[PDB]
Amino acid sequence: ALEVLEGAGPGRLHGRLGIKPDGQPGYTRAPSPPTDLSMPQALARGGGFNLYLSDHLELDRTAPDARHASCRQLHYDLSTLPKASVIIVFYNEPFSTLMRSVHSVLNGTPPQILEELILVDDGSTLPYIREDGNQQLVEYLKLLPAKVRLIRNEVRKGIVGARMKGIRASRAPIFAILDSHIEVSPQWLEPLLLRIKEDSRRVVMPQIDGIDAETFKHIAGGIGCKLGFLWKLMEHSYEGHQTARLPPEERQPSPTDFQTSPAMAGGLFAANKAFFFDVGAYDEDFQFWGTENLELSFRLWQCGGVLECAPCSRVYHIFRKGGSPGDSITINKMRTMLWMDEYADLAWRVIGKPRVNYRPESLEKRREWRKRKGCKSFRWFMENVFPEGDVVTLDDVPYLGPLRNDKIGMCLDNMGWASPGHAVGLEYCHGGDTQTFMFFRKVGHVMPVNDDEACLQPSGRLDWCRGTAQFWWDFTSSGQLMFRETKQCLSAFGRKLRMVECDDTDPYQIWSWTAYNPPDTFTFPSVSRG
Amino acid sequence: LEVLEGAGPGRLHGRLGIKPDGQPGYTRAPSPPTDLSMPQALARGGGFNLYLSDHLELDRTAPDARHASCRQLHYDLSTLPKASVIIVFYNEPFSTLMRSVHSVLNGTPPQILEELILVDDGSTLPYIREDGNQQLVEYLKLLPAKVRLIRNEVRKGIVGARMKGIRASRAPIFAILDSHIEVSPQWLEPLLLRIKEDSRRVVMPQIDGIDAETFKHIAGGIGCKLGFLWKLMEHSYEGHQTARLPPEERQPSPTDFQTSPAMAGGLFAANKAFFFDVGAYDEDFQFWGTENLELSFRLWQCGGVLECAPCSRVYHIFRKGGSGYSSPGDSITINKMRTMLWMDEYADLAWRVIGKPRVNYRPESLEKRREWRKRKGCKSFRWFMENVFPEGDVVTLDDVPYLGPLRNDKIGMCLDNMGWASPGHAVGLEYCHGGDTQTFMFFRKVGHVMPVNDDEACLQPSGRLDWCRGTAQFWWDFTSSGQLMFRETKQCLSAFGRKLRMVECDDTDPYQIWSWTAYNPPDTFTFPSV
């Protein structure tokens, strides 16, 4: 309700925030948490973080500068940089974390480059937010710059629907999407604006540091810039063996270099608004949460965009511990498979061949849009954007199906635990997903189809896949599973899994494995009719 | 001996249990003694009259409990998939077990019966033991080769016993039956046809009765749809719950397959592959109890459908005044805790109803089960209540607005179930102490006032608990002034004179003002520590 900045200075570029006319803070900080606080409870009561502590900490909390020293040697001309609209969507975000995020942005963003701060209430039900509530939020916003504007979805629409509401309400040539439980490092916005100014086709995302949900300590982010994806359709940081496949000039980049990434971690990024809509914005038939980051990543790269990571733009993020819709996660994965072309056959089988209502009629309009825009193929994506992946073409998956030993008339069985850490069994073949395995030849990995993170080991037991010799298997021309490092072979003798000297005359070590020969085109599965 | 001599209607597998010399392989007992004390014989027979069971024939003819229209259906046994029938037993007497086997063989066409797997779950009876008198093994030699016996060296329980049989089955479909049953004609054909069309269906026959005392065949009086109680036990749809169904489903034809939120016991058929893909059983369940609800919840949430076939009927001996075996006391509680994993926030209500137990529910294994639920992409329990069981009295926890003491401030006392909590006894007024005996809950959808430990017991204006019914005889309103008003008579409950009597409603009389703690459970149920 007031656009003035009284008290502006370093660490508080928008002036003293949230001060009442009488010079008192517009909210009552909480006392120190009780000494007998039961943490697993508070987390379950606080929606994934310790709210007793969050309420006690100041909204103007000072954070360590997580940037590399060389990031501070950079110069920005705030007069020539374009303005940006910061968007924070939230559903029932507690007052302390939400307002600390707002305070962090205003305190650490020069007013010259910040057009506005848009808060999107995605149908919250907490009394402190509701239109028919106690009005705490609305009352407190009057104590912040007029830049801050609140808009609401009368019904919770989800991440996509909520972000679209905010993006549409923005003015700046650039918008920046942030979480509702964050704290920024210094000069977080300047690098993003300069990068997008030079080329509006770039979608740039800050690097994400951590705030401990239990202690709220500031933690350095350990994630590199480059993110791949798993065939379960979730982003996955480049592993050691994947980083080694990069061009030698990109394996150890400077801490100030902007680095491309095939995929986006979450939803913290900046983009030119015009280009964002021309490249398809979001798929608004996505439901609530899940996979929209990968769908955007695939579409962006294929349809003329660039996804980059800015190590000099850092934002802290509270990762939940204590925790806190129907069919939404599976639907979003099916819709994302549109952009995977023939590779969708592999992803479809990995997530269990679901038969859901993915809104086919709407997905077909999205297919028409993809055609008109002239987007490139997923094969192009794998070969040019993510060529470091273990599966660049489907020929990299030569086998997919049961691993059957004819001698004992049984098949390998993950025993209902596709998670790493458990023993693999021998059971009578029934053709279900629990008994199908696939082979990634680039790494010699034997994995259950429902989890490309679990790998068979000579111990006869599953463990987390690593691109090393500890998980490298060869499937001989005679049907043997040979562990390359020890040059031994896996046997089913006595309905037990043991490693034995290789000998193709021993029928107990001869396995059959269905060849994987998927079609040139993935035909989506038919859909049927509170 | 896969040959069958004497095959005809009533004995589709031939004359069973005939010795080489043409005599039956077992001697029927004489008529029960005339001076038989029935309450004793039931206790000494494991829940049924064994004197009579031993006297009855193994080929006992049963009445056709099917609706007349069920016989007008035709099945093509050549196009139906085969099934493996599994019967697990722990110390089941010879007469009831073999009558079950005879009933299945006599009444199942050999073209659709792959095999009959008998699972000895560590029985100790001499007639079963490997080191016993060999009665069972010797008598099995007089039955078709389809019938094969397998054993658990140590008693594993219902889940462990069934999984052994399921894993050992060969047919694409398995059907589990109890060891004390008799089937109606064409019991298996409807299940095979239904699962053939859609392998995601788990179909269960309707269960008729065999009187434990007289062995009379009795028509089951329970409809097809089964809900559940917050004590975590299946419960047949009630009258007022059926009325909430769509009008086209309140009285369906006797040939229609009907969905059911919950499974009665363990009598069902399923595609073996799909059964394993949907998590099979939770093999950390102990001994007896609740696996049917865990399977029911998991089945619906993870892409399955539970249906009941009224044209598929099986008689079942329900025990009376006795049990065929004992189990630890905490084993049932453990199974209930593990079932609460699939109930999400609703587990808070279930936890309180069964008395906030603190048991060793094997958390490390249950947390792996949680990861499986995430990878599989199973839907939430709220989805289940709103989509699978929307006819329940508690669809959201908002349907339970009050849970806690019912206290009258005037006399400084609370309602007290007086150590009963079972229906049929008077409710008392006692000094408040905060224990389970003094906490009550309110189901607003039917106006029920119940002790927290029994959602089947309802307060009545008589000052006494009785079996809950969805009628005006149990409807209470909790006014804005704190009154318990019986809607039918428009009177209010008073504590005047430390007695519970109905009086004219008047918010100025302090003897009729009650306080009732509001129920506001968390968004997430945190399991108790072990």
Ligand SMILES: O=c1ccn([C@@H]2O[C@H](COP(=O)(O)OP(=O)(O)O)[C@@H](O)[C@H]2O)c(=O)[nH]1
């Ligand atoms: O239905 C929803 C779910 C989430 N969000 C908001 O979207 C942002 C991203 O969600 P989340 O915080 O879960 O992301 P993550 O914690 O995985 O970084 C947060 O501000 C949420 O409050 C929302 O507006 N609607």
Ligand SMILES: O=c1ccn([C@@H]2O[C@H](COP(=O)(O)OP(=O)(O)O)[C@@H](O)[C@H]2O)c(=O)[nH]1
């Ligand atoms: O530890 C056990 C308990 C039960 N059962 C068998 O499992 C079936 C189901 O048990 P029961 O009939 O007692 O269940 P109820 O119908 O009484 O709920 C019966 O054939 C039991 O003999 C078993 O094999 N092991």
Ligand SMILES: [Mn+2]
């Ligand atoms: Mn977040």
Ligand SMILES: [Mn+2]
């Ligand atoms: Mn990895």
Ligand SMILES: [Mn+2]
């Ligand atoms: Mn039984």
Ligand SMILES: [Mn+2]
């Ligand atoms: Mn009832």
